């Protein structure tokens, strides 16, 4: 997963930069709440068929992380691993490998 800060600039460049399918994801943190971040993932109304969307997420209350109630993680890692199992709430699933 994320190689590091970078979300905003990078991340929405380089994943309009090959047209990577659903499963592509990166991890990037939030400069309005520090602790916080935002999941990027390659999100589309289908139509347009080349976006991407950020999830705004919320530090857990027991030091850990969630995107939603139903996946509430204490780690990042372990959040990954199991979005790469499938889509927990998310409109994308975390299956895609890390490279650039």
Same mark, same amino acid.
């Given at each position: 997963? !994320?190689?590091?800060?970078?979300?905003?600039?990078? &991340? $929405?460049?380089?994943?309009?930069?090959?047209? #990577?399918? =659903?499963?592509?994801?990166?991890?990037?943190?939030? $400069?309005?709440?520090?602790? &916080?971040?935002?999941?990027?993932? =390659? *999100?589309?109304? *289908?139509?347009?068929?080349? /976006?991407?969307? /950020? !999830?705004?997420?919320?530090?857990? *209350? #027991?030091?850990? !992380?969630?995107?939603?109630?139903? &996946?509430?993680?204490?780690?990042?890692?372990?959040?990954?691993?199991h979005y790469? $199992? =499938?889509? &927990?709430?998310? @409109? @994308? =699933?975390?299956?895609?490998? @890390?490279?650039?």
């Amino acid at each position: 997963w !994320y190689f590091g800060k970078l979300g905003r600039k990078d &991340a $929405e460049r380089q994943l309009l930069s090959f047209g #990577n399918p =659903r499963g592509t994801f990166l991890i990037r943190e939030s $400069e309005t709440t520090k602790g &916080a971040y935002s999941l990027s993932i =390659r *999100d589309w109304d *289908d139509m347009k068929g080349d /976006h991407v969307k /950020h !999830y705004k997420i919320r530090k857990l *209350d #027991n030091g850990g !992380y969630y995107i939603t109630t139903r &996946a509430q993680f204490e780690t990042l890692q372990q959040l990954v691993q199991h979005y790469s $199992e =499938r889509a &927990a709430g998310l @409109c @994308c =699933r975390l299956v895609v490998p @890390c490279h650039k």
